[model samples]
Target: MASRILLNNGAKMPILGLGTWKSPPGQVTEAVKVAIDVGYRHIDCAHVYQNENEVGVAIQEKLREQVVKREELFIVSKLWCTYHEKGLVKGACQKTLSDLKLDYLDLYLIHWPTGFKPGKEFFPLDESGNVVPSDTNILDTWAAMEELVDEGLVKAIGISNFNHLQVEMILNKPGLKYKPAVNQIECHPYLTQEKLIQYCQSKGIVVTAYSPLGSPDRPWAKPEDPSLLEDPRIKAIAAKHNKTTAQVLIRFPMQRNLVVIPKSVTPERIAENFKVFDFELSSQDMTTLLSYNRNWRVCALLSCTSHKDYPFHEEF
Candidate 1:
């Protein structure tokens, strides 16, 4: 098994985790089970996925078989944008805890910097087709999140998809009892996020790479968007290493000391993603892969066009 890295708060988090974002409802539970069996100790999940119960079932079964203990597993979940209101943050996390049947999450994150009205779907629009603005501010929501740690409902608090400015906003707020331990973002050779990663590290914030394989499985993304797994450059590099392109991509991020979560529903692919720890990427191989950077972004939020913080000009 791969070793764990200590969070800024002194909590240990696995260097690798199974991403459950697009793992599909029908295959999620089995994927969770197989991943656990394949020696994955970290499982990243979220309420937005609507499959926590199924993931819970897998954890229950694993515990029953004594394959792993609840404490041994580093479980991560996020507070969705719809629940950014101070009143809803605890209840939202509680709902996730209830669904997962877990006492507390290993790490909890503010899913996005943007917010939405309670009970409203992410992209709610009025009859005029205008985007509805959320009433709650992120700092107000973070206030409630700090309470979760005090209440012992979460072990660590972090943020996801948050840019440097947004993280700075949180850090600048007064009376902040808990600092964010990690910033989860889309990172790959194509979108290396060098400055952001360095900034976070300088602040003692651990950066976790999501969509590490370019999120080829994202439902909204198209085949034409470019697949990291099949990129000829990655293929050539893999050939030299006698490894698969996916393996090289996985190892590349790991070599940078960033926590990585690669999503897969297939058993062989799940096993393959976990096998990255045994290998090392050479300096030239790393440079070869880094040279393929095209600023590719695979997980753009189509609904976030109206969002004031939406980063991209293109829409899906």
Candidate 2:
């Protein structure tokens, strides 16, 4: 198993989690099984992934085989943009709970700050191919989420893909019952986000890095896009440590005290991604990797840039 980071709410979250975004459906179940058998206790999931049921199947199988119990694992899910309405919030939580076959979630987050028109489709769009944004207020959405904690449906609440100012809004909300315990964000060597991570940690919020390996399989990536794994600098350092670039990429974030979740469905690769606990990067190497920062964002929400609540408009 991996090291655990203590949350603001006193919950210990595993530092390395299995990311399920874009994890192929037919293979996710087996990947989830192999991940746990190799000592992974945290699974990152979301309602928009469209693969929760399969993830649940693997978790159920592990429980039946006594490989791990429900309490031994930390399961996370996010509320979709379409479910931002105050009246619709709880129902969306219920839907994810029903889909995952779990009574409650270990951690839940607002997937993004902007809202989309509520509907069955994940991304509601107009004739121009632009995503339709909703007028629902984010504070109202958060107020509704606070009710989930009262109902015992979620142990911790958080925000994802939100910038510093956006998080400030939540922090300053009047009568706020609970401050967010975690802030999940896109982070890697190319986009180190040093100040943002420092600000969040200073406030006692844990930072979880998605696309920690720079999301090589991301859907929007182009052929000319740079690959973090294949980078010459990272490769040279990996050779120096006698480790694979993938392991070095993962250990880089772990060395910085940020939780990392790199997505993969191949069994051997999944197991390899988790074997990052034994090695430590030197201070000189850490500084060298940090110098590679170029402010590249792989998952920039271009379609939602015009939304009133779009998160990336400000400098972190």
Candidate 3:
């Protein structure tokens, strides 16, 4: 099992979690079961994954089997872009709770800063195939999220895919109720987010590194893209440590004191991903890995680029 990090709100979140994005519904249930059976106490989910019900079933089974108690397990879910409207936030949260079969979530995050047309469509689009933008202010959405904490619907609230500037906006909000507990971002050696991580940490917001293995399974991955798992440098380090490349990649963020969630449905892979605590990376190895930055991003979310709150526009 992974160690836990204390959130700004004093909630302890496991530093490692099972990421469910891109996990198909049918297979995700088994994935969750396998992960839980393999000592994974944290499960990372989102409404956008569309497999919460399946993930819920697996969790219930584990609970019934006495494999882990509800309080002992840390489950996380995120609100979708279309649900950013203040009036829709609670409903979206309730929907996820109902689907996840949970009385309350361990952590909940605003999936992204950009808002979309409030509707049933996950990606509401116009005739031009661009996402329809909503005028909802980010602070208003955050105000409603604070209500979730007050109502006991979630233990902590946070944001995802938000840049440093967006984080500053939230921190500087005149009447901010709750400081974000975590900031989940697409982080890997190829796009090492040193500056942004520093800024977030300075504010006491724990950073969660998603796609730490470089998301080789990302749909947009091209043949020319550098593969973290197969990279010669990482492979050499893995050989030095007698660990798998995935374990080396997963440990990178852990060494940086950042929460990391690497997605994998395969039982062997899931088990292997969690066996990272046994080895430690040296300073020389850390420098070699950090030197691979190409400013690359696998999940840039370009469809909503025109939205005013689009996060990637900033350098950080």
Model 1: per-residue Cα lDDT at residue 132: 68
Residue 172 deviation, candidate 3, in Å? Answer: 1.2
The number of the candidate with the highest lDDT is 3
lDDT of 3 by residue, 57-102 (tens): 9999999999999998999999999988888999999999999999
Question: Which candidate model has the greater lDDT, 1 or 3?
Answer: 3
For each candidate, the alpha-carbon lDDT, in order, equals 0.86, 0.90, 0.92
RMSD of each: 2.5, 1.2, 1.2
- lDDT for model 3 comes to 0.92
Give a tens-digit lDDT track for model 2, residues 162-238.
Answer: 89888889899999998998899999889999989999998889999989899998889998988999999999999
Residue 295, candidate 1: C-alpha displacement in angstroms? 2.1
The weakest ten consecutive residues by lDDT in model 1 span 307-316
Model 1 misplaced regions, further than 4 Å? 120-122, 126-131, 311-316
Off-target runs (Cα >4 Å) in candidate 2 are none
Q: Estimate each model's TM-score.
A: 0.94, 0.98, 0.98
